[PDB]
Write a protein that binds this ligand. Structure first.
Ligand SMILES: N[C@H](CCC[C@H](N)C(=O)O)C(=O)O
Ligand SMILES: N[C@H](CCC[C@H](N)C(=O)O)C(=O)O
Ligand SMILES: [Zn+2]
Ligand SMILES: [Zn+2]
Ligand SMILES: [Zn+2]
Ligand SMILES: [Zn+2]
Lengths: 380, 380
């Protein structure tokens, strides 16, 4: 009779998926959420800043404080034509909920919310505080999101004891992985200068695409490290590359390369910057580069939260998750600044940021059950 | 007292440079030209087709027919901020006329026009026909320009005996080079397919930039040939390269590469297509490619026109031009279809398609003198 909760999770998820909340625009997601939480006695606190909307919702007044954390923004869809169903359709086909944000992360956001709602309804005088910390910019610059909330709470010495981040942690089967940390993320925006001219007079010009070809090949194959006991290896990906005026008979003046590294503690942001500089010098390239550090590697100190979620997954679906630190990053690293233990769990990540993103509705239901059991394990 | 003609050439040139005639838009250039030719008794015939304007102007009724050929369109400027003077300012600074189209090819277009005007004024009952064949799209697709005029003339068996193309042929000093032929030009528009996804989950995706890096490096360094007695070597240039959604945490689905070859007769369009296909296969790349042949190599049969222009340059500025076939292409190849001898001569090409394009005003004056002497040599 908790197929009832499963339906609540699914309809909320669909609600949210239908809102085209490309970072940092919330498109009304948090309003929906805040409305239903308020009706159940949660204290609502809005913390907008610049173009970002943030929500801090609480039920309870004392420690321990357990916060569910997540984001309502989603990455761009791409041509809606490339999608079998419209990206914001929230269609359910053969047990799969389709849509941008279905797996990253509106599905599990809905699951966490319903778990919190149901727990609080069942246990009005529960020990501790159940909170939700929701931002509309996790996917982009993220300068005014979760980190703004964290700064506000710290400045008035408000505490978070435990934080469960609902990012999609699972690899092949729901519950097979939880995350106890993340690699860092740093992006280079690299401009290599050539000299514009006529394609048929290349000796009077300098084609930066040709000059940088070897560099590009070395950059994409260079082995930064082999990981270590705590993290998978550092990985570099070129996200964007652009040169040219659109004309076929003009040599472009400049080549733009944007590349990102998800890095482990075998290297640092400074080691990465120095090595790239050294590669550019070795290839005698004229350039300018702008570096943007999104975050450093982070590991949480394991304790009762890791125990509680690991046990909840075992108790609900019968397997033991492996604790890992791969994949992307999350706002967990900000929340760790408060001294909170941070652990992540959510649905399959196999379709995130892809065309035809989707999530199993059976998995969303079990997620709700798992998040609920986690609360019981922690507070009771 | 032919500093007088020099001033006519310069002011016409400035007139034309001020008109932002990005291919195929004439922006009124040919109207100016046709107006001043008509006043001197030239028969004007407009041959517009689609978005291209073409002009066929004649003085005389009999053979031999000598046609001056050129184009009023210019390649895009780029950010006007990168220019010392506005690109359409037509400023003269220290003996240099600055502007897009100054050297390619409004300067020499003006010189040819004034040479024709002055010759016809001096010799109203001249032998032969003096013609001008002017198009507003030489630089772009060129499907409706000079080739449209050529087709029209051939269809009514109208003849061109000799054609002087005023493209900028000179390398270091005015008159050091004339052109008796050109390499071919073929462009590949290449799309390499990957799989879009999350930068931090590259194993669930396929980054086409990474997959194609080695190919790109091989393509830009592959030696097609070493030229031969008639042409310089084949040269490949990548003009445009684009991949990415603008996001730094998404792996792009597709990489676009546009590349052009200026090729000599050691290879063919078919050999080029087959080799590129073979390189792509060797690197196991999934792709689609669209080929666009702009023209094949061409050599003119030397005769009285090459003699006349070579002698005119010697007689006017004292040096002997070398006959060469390098640089870009020209509409000469179309006009050759009529059986005409085609030779090109014009000012320095060192700044064409570049920022701060300019041309020496002293050279424009001597060009006028050279084109005039050429007519005398041919007709008298
Ligand atoms: N500006 C941040 C956004 C991170 C979003 C995170 N969810 C991920 O892509 O793992 C970065 O480039 O790391
Ligand atoms: N669509 C033609 C334009 C040629 C213009 C010609 N003046 C040159 O660039 O040499 C090509 O790609 O060859
Ligand atoms: Zn997410
Ligand atoms: Zn994401
Ligand atoms: Zn030209
Ligand atoms: Zn040109």
């Amino acid at each position: 009779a908790s197929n009832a909760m499963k339906e609540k999770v699914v309809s909320l998820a669909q609600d949210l998926i239908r809102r085209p909340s490309i970072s940092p625009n919330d498109e009304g997601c948090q309003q929906i959420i805040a409305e239903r939480l308020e009706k159940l006695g949660f204290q609502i606190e809005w913390m907008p800043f610049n173009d970002t909307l943030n929500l801090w919702a609480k039920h309870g007044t004392s420690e321990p404080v357990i916060a569910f954390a997540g984001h309502t923004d989603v990455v761009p869809t791409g041509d809606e034509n490339q999608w079998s169903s419209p990206p914001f359709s929230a269609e359910i086909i053969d047990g799969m909920l389709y849509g941008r944000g279905a797996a990253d992360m509106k599905g599990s956001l809905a699951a966490m919310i319903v778990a919190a709602e149901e727990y609080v309804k069942a246990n009005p005088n529960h020990k501790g505080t159940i909170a939700l910390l929701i931002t509309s910019d996790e996917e982009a610059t993220a300068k005014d999101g979760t980190i703004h909330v964290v700064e506000t709470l710290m400045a008035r010495d408000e505490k978070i004891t435990y934080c469960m981040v609902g990012e999609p942690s699972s690899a092949k089967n729901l519950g097979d992985v939880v995350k106890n940390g993340r690699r860092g993320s740093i992006t280079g925006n690299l401009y290599i200068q050539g000299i514009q001219g006529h394609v048929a007079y290349p000796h009077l010009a300098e084609n930066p695409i040709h000059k940088a070809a070897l560099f590009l090949q070395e950059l994409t194959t260079y082995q930064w490290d082999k990981g270590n006991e705590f993290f998978p290896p550092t990985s570099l990906q070129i996200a964007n590359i652009h040169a040219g005026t659109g004309s076929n008979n003009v040599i472009p003046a400049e080549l733009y390369i944007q590349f990102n590294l998800r890095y482990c503690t075998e290297v640092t942001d400074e080691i990465i910057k120095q090595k790239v500089a050294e590669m550019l010098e070795k290839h005698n390239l004229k350039y300018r580069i702008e570096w943007n550090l999104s975050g450093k590697p982070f590991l949480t100190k394991p304790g009762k939260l890791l125990d509680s979620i690991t046990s909840a997954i075992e108790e609900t679906i019968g397997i033991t998750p492996k604790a890992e630190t791969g994949g992307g990053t999350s706002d967990g690293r900000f929340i760790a600044l408060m001294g909170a233990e941070v652990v992540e769990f959510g649905p399959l990540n196999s379709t995130i940021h892809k065309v035809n993103e989707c999530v199993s509705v059976e998995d969303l239901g079990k997620c709700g059950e798992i998040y609920h059991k986690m609360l019981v394990n922690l507070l009771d």
